Amino acid sequence: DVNTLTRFVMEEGRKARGTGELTQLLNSLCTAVKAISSAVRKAGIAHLYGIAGKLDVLSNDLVMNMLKSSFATCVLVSEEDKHAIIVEPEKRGKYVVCFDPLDGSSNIDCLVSVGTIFGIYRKKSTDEPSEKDALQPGRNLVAAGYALYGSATMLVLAMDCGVNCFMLDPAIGEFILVDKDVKIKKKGKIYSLNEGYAKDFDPAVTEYIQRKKFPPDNSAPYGARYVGSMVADVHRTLVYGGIFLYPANKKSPNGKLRLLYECNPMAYVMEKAGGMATTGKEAVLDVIPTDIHQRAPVILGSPDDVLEFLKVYEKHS
Amino acid sequence: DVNTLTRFVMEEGRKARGTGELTQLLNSLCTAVKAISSAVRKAGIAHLYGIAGKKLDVLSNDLVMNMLKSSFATCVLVSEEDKHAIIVEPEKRGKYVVCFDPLDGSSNIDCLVSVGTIFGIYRKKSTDEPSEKDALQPGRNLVAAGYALYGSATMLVLAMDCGVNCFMLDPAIGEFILVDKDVKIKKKGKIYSLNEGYAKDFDPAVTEYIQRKKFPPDNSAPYGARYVGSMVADVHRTLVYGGIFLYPANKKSPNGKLRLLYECNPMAYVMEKAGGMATTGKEAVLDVIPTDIHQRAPVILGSPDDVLEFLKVYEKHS
Amino acid sequence: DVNTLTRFVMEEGRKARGTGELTQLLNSLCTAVKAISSAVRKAGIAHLYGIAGKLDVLSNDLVMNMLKSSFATCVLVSEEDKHAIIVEPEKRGKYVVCFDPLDGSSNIDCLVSVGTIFGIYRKKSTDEPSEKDALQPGRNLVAAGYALYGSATMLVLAMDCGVNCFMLDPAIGEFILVDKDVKIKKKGKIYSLNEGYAKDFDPAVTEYIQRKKFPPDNSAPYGARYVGSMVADVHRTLVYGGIFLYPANKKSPNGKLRLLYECNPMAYVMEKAGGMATTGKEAVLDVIPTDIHQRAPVILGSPDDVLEFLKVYEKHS
Amino acid sequence: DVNTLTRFVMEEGRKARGTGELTQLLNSLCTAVKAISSAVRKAGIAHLYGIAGKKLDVLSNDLVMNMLKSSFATCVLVSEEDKHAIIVEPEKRGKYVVCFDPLDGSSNIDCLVSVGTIFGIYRKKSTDEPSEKDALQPGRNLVAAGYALYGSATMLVLAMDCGVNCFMLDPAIGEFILVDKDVKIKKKGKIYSLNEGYAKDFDPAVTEYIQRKKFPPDNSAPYGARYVGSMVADVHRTLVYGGIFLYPANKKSPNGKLRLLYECNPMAYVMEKAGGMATTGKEAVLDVIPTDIHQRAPVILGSPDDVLEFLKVYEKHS
Ligand SMILES: COc1ccc(-c2occ(C(=O)O)c2C(=O)O)cc1
Ligand SMILES: COc1ccc(-c2occ(C(=O)O)c2C(=O)O)cc1
Ligand SMILES: COc1ccc(-c2occ(C(=O)O)c2C(=O)O)cc1
Ligand SMILES: COc1ccc(-c2occ(C(=O)O)c2C(=O)O)cc1
């Protein structure tokens, strides 16, 4: 029996018997993703090249305008904006959204996969809404996920009910549910990080990669894959198993991926799908943030691969 | 003044003073690429999942095959998907030979990684009945070669004697728009690209070159690493940003792993026409003479300074 | 403020504080409309013609399966099905839908405009659902409308709040609201019927048309338009005003157009937009049906034009 | 065996051993048509309504003009949208004259009625500097003519000396697929098409002919009536289903209202190449020599038996 993203979101909203704001939110966000997707695949590029006589800025505008006009949000934090955006009073609702509107576009000149990452919170205060309202830890997420603009476009949605993957059918502009209640493999065969930073690696990371290239017990070495686009690397880890790493080194004691709108949503999707995500010291979702653009190390993926990483991590104290 | 793939192809045909076959060929193939692109982005997938109640690389291979045959411009077609060369039936014969990988990367297309189509075109070097031998030319004889990348958008990269040209597919009207004329690769890049999970098996020269990239001698910054696992995506990133790509010969695979006729050769041609290099380690990829249509070959390609810096290490190890 | 069909439908349901069923029904039905539109415009036709080596059945299948899987319906009446379909128990909801999945399709070989017509009732009886639940008169309609696949694709949705027109953006698969709370002109300058039936016309119809071609007063005669596709002619009548006729003659004392899934929805759209729709003797929404595929004559459009006709019909009565 | 418009036009151009100009022309016009179709179906309309925070007939005329100019195949362009003929600048000139209605039916596009692009192509008949004089040839001089209908689907109908061929636009891939080879119209149809609201102004011959269709003398069934009000839609139905279409001369309009160069002539040429007829009443439409580019002409076209039966009635009334 066929199911769409919009009908799935509408039913989950019906069962919660809430105000309906989170339903309007997710429908607004899904509409923005379809618009971004069309723009990313270069619809209308012929007009810019004279047939009749910016992508990360346009994407950021779509998500902002779609979220504001949903009447479901009060605080908006974006990778593109130095400060939180406070939704005007007439359009305020009770949700806080952190998003990276087009992750990976720094390298979009080469047509690498790009994505939209988001995490949604309920306001935990009563005062006038502020940047403070988005400084909740990952565990407080009500929903998170991403849209991948790869060889095709898929939205991956995480809630307490689990992870569901919807494929965008461009013929009709509808997200079709294609993978229900996804669970990640217990252990994978692929490891993923930028190894050009090897001279700066934490010594514990240096051993784990050694263990992947050179296995102790007669096993085959892991394959290496690193697209350089987080949504692409994390989705492949979800589909094929394995591990993804962008860790803390000494030249970067807090990693480089941003916590509120990259590490937390991916960590949340990973945990709801039977996987793990750690800074190294604590679970990613247990970090309490003090600044909306602060960074965080992240190692996520199949539980056996993250555990094996943690087994080695404690060997270096 | 606006320029499309069709306008570019018709204009180059005028300058070549030919029969017009290669123009129908490139136009037919470009039509197959539009159909592949549509299937890859999952048009009609709602019908597979029950809205009203064939694998992609088999579909891709059929699109390319049927479009090329029906161009009346080919005689021998070599495909990654077919163990033997296809001999185009006589009433549809033309003078060109086409080697192609109809959907390179599809081993990992389940994760929505970038995938592509790769192609290389030769002029038939015979008068007799056409045969598999007509595809056993080295890359240097290539008349036209390139790829379509099905990435964040769909781009066709077309390399000929006049140089490398990049066309963007506008899905609203199904047209390849020329967006980069006469492309050239940076002289030297800051990214290196290969699968390091095979590190225990590396040639000692490869092990040193990667070591030189992570730990630079002259106190410079180390290179960044990228490896998508899909050749078209990695090669294209190498063309746009410069850098180096490696799927080299090790000992356990003395001939590399990538296929020569429809992966190494088409990519080598694009690289050389764009001011870059592509080497097996011992000779330039385009100078290898093939003895089998599916034979493998090592490949190291990219910005000219990086392949030279690699060959210096390769020759230091005699 | 941007407004989509999805936002419009959800907002009306929120204010009504109902079960949420009618919202998923209309959302499911609109998805079926997007799929029909893609098929009508011949997407993928290159595969039927050998690039790699039924239309009104496909449409009926889309509306059927999409309505069933919405969990909001119990009885489905289709122009394509001889008897009413009773949705199986585990998928039942409290609504009844009469629909024409591809009206006009006999002339689709010439690429004339075609359409999808629908009307929605609430189950009124207390029994097990049955064909009787669909034999309500038009006045009991909860919602009705059409999709027109013309030069572009538009969904026209009429409810108690009035008539609203939504334009399908194929780049993103979204119905964009483009005409809020539309009303038909008091009097138009176009009349629409098949004048090849002239020898069989009711004597009152023959006089009314004569009045349009040869005006009694100092006025200009009406222009004539007849596409032959009910959705197309009815939409032109809403946009530009005027009158549409498919009346009772001698060969068909009950006309030819079907009451439940052609005459009723159009009459409901017409009335909610300030127009009228009459059989000649009674208003279309006042006919009590005894068989789901029964016919009814129809004269609809601007009220002054329907009235002027009714003055003539009673003169012959 | 599958054929596209692009393959078909390139193959016919090869067979004619011509300059390639008409090939460049039709490919540019077909590209303009795909872009028109995308806008007509309201692609991107969400952006005008604030999703992120120019009328169809002006855009169509601008698309067709720009594609034709930049094809290097034309010198004079006549459009319903332009008061005087357009003279293509010297550096972009070629030998063809094109008369077109860029978005016929668009006065009522608010009701989403089917609309279309109509076009006719002549060879320049002078050696002088090109001018409006070059567009005043009769229909018999037509080299190619036809239309694109933006209906329930988008179809391009192309008529040449080789006959009439119909191409369906596959929006999934942006390609015109050949779906109807060498089309021929019924000898006699069962549908008549005109605006009968103008009844008080009819020519007495039209009044009798229409009377004969509603009330048949020879005891046959009466004809059906269809009139979309959009020439391309009504003419296309007459081609696919047979029958007769009329926009004739009355007393208040002795020349009808449809324009001769870019509505009557192309439809007449398609009609004749497809085994049908098209008359002013007095002469065949293609035999009229025009004196002004925006001049009107009466037209009765369709199946040969129906136009003949009408002419018998027309000659009965002198
Ligand atoms: C799409 O799944 C959903 C949608 C909405 C909810 C939801 O739960 C409590 C709500 C509240 O109003 O407090 C609320 C909402 O409507 O904002 C839950 C899941
Ligand atoms: C697309 O650019 C082109 C097109 C055609 C050619 C071309 O050169 C020699 C030809 C020959 O007939 O021998 C020939 C062709 O027409 O097959 C070269 C480049
Ligand atoms: C399109 O907007 C809507 C959505 C829902 C309704 C609606 O009104 C009463 C309902 C009921 O439960 O009886 C009901 C529903 O939810 O079925 C009305 C308008
Ligand atoms: C679409 O099929 C075609 C294409 C081209 C032609 C053609 O015939 C004579 C030409 C000339 O240059 O005089 C000419 C052309 O190339 O303009 C004929 C049919």
UniProtKB/TrEMBL annotation, chains A, C:
Amino acids binding Mg(2+) 1: E79, D100, L102
Residue span(s) of domain Fructose-1-6-bisphosphatase class 1 C-terminal: 184-313
Residue intervals of the Fructose-1-6-bisphosphatase class I N-terminal domain: 4-179
Catalytic activity: beta-D-fructose 1,6-bisphosphate + H2O = beta-D-fructose 6-phosphate + phosphate
Protein task: Catalyzes the hydrolysis of fructose 1,6-bisphosphate to fructose 6-phosphate in the presence of divalent cations, acting as a rate-limiting enzyme in gluconeogenesis. Plays a role in regulating glucose sensing and insulin secretion of pancreatic beta-cells. Appears to modulate glycerol gluconeogenesis in liver. Important regulator of appetite and adiposity; increased expression of the protein in liver after nutrient excess increases circulating satiety hormones and reduces appetite-stimulating neuropeptides and thus seems to provide a feedback mechanism to limit weight gain.
Protein name (database record): Fructose-1,6-bisphosphatase 1
InterPro entries: FBPase_C_dom, FBPase_class-1, FBPase_N, FBPtase, Fructose_bisphosphatase_AS
Subunit relationships: Homotetramer.
Cofactor(s) the protein needs: Mg(2+)
CDD domains the record matches: FBPase (cd00354)
Family annotation (NCBIfam families): PRK09293.1-1
Pathway: Carbohydrate biosynthesis; gluconeogenesis
Organism: Homo sapiens (Human)
The family this protein is said to belong to: Belongs to the FBPase class 1 family.
Enzyme class: hydrolase
UniProt-recorded Gene Ontology molecular function terms: fructose 1,6-bisphosphate 1-phosphatase activity; metal ion binding; nucleotide binding
Enzyme Commission number: 3.1.3.11
The entry's keywords: Acetylation, Allosteric enzyme, Carbohydrate metabolism, Gluconeogenesis, Hydrolase, Magnesium, Metal-binding, Nucleotide-binding, Phosphoprotein
Keyword presence, S-adenosyl-L-methionine: no
